[PDB]
């Protein structure tokens, strides 16, 4: 809202930032990008 | 028009105050509207009370205290520091004396100066313990009207009792002086100094 009201240019696109975060297994587990799963459902290739 | 009298004596002034219009003895609950929108809906207004001592179910639900009277809350906080636990009779005596002193001084509305002191001493920014990681820090948190009035009452009470400890002046006049000082604004009363010092540290670590 503040950026829209303080913008000079109307109908501004308001771009978004794009990046790829590569996590090692330890850091991913610690930061809960992934987590320990049960043995049967470790085989779920499907994301939620 | 006739005076309907009863053989049991009842004072003429209180009979008149009953017959003409409902009112307290010396203070009016009318025309005491405040602009403190943040603290309205918590202080009991438009509900006059004959005596501040009430055995009311106020600590069962959540916001029963909101419609609980504020004068009762002040006289409740006045019972503290150990041996002064209970003794609502003593508490009511002291608050009656304090209101009489604040009535003889500062001839404006006594409940109005009381509430102005409450709002001025109520801290609006506080600090909460944030874990931080190893070194616990303070976090500057805004927003609490109930805690604002609660801390104002607590601050006024403990300042009055700290003043009234180990001295010749009685708790009634100490409390009255603290209330008038906080209401008018003097940067000298112990409650208001503590509130602004807490405010300063909260803004510093904000």
């Amino acid at each position: 809202r503040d950026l829209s009201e303080a913008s000079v240019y109307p109908e501004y696109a308001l771009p978004k930032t794009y990046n790829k975060l590569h996590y090692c297994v330890s850091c991913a587990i610690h930061a809960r990008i992934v987590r320990v799963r049960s043995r049967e459902d470790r085989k779920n290739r499907a994301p939620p | 028009f006739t005076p309907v009298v009863l053989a049991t004596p009842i004072p003429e002034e209180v009979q008149q105050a009953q017959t003409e219009i409902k009112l307290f003895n010396k203070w009016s609950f009318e025309e005491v509207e405040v602009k403190d929108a943040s603290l309205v809906d918590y202080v009991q207004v438009r509900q006059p009370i004959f005596v501040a001592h009430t055995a009311g179910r106020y600590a069962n639900k959540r916001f029963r205290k909101a419609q609980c009277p504020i004068i009762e809350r002040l006289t409740n906080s006045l019972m503290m520091n150990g041996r002064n636990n209970g003794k609502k009779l003593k508490a009511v005596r002291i608050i009656k004396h304090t209101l009489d002193i604040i009535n003889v001084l500062t001839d404006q509305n006594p409940i109005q100066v009381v509430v102005d002191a409450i709002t001025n001493t109520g801290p609006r920014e506080d600090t909460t313990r944030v874990g931080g990681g190893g070194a616990a820090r303070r976090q500057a948190v805004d927003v609490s009207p109930l805690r604002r009035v609660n801390q104002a009452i607590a601050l006024l009470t403990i300042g009055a009792r700290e003043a009234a400890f180990r001295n010749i002046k009685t708790i009634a006049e100490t409390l009255a002086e603290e209330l008038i000082n906080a209401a008018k604004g003097s940067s000298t009363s112990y409650a208001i100094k503590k509130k602004d010092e807490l405010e300063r540290v909260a803004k510093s670590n904000r």
Binding site: R1 | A37, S38, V40, D41, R62, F63, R124, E125, D126, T128, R129, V130, G131, V141, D142, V143, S144, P145, L146, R147, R148, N150, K203
Partner: protein, 63 residues
């Protein structure tokens, strides 16, 4: 100090390690549709007014 008045429009929920604070969302009387995420030290309920010394900050997530 510039003081702004805002009313809580939804109590988002209690947060913090010990739970002593509550995240709420507040709406400003001026500039309709302007809402800010704030935190509460004491209790807070629906339709409650609010005094803010500064209003240019938000708290999104706490863990």
């Amino acid at each position: 100090t510039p003081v702004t008045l805002a009313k809580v429009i939804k109590v988002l929920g209690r947060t913090g390690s010990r739970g002593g604070v509550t995240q709420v969302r507040v709406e400003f009387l001026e500039d309709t549709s302007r809402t800010i995420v704030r935190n509460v030290k004491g209790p807070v309920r629906e339709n409650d007014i609010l005094v803010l010394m500064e209003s240019e900050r938000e708290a999104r997530r706490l863990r």
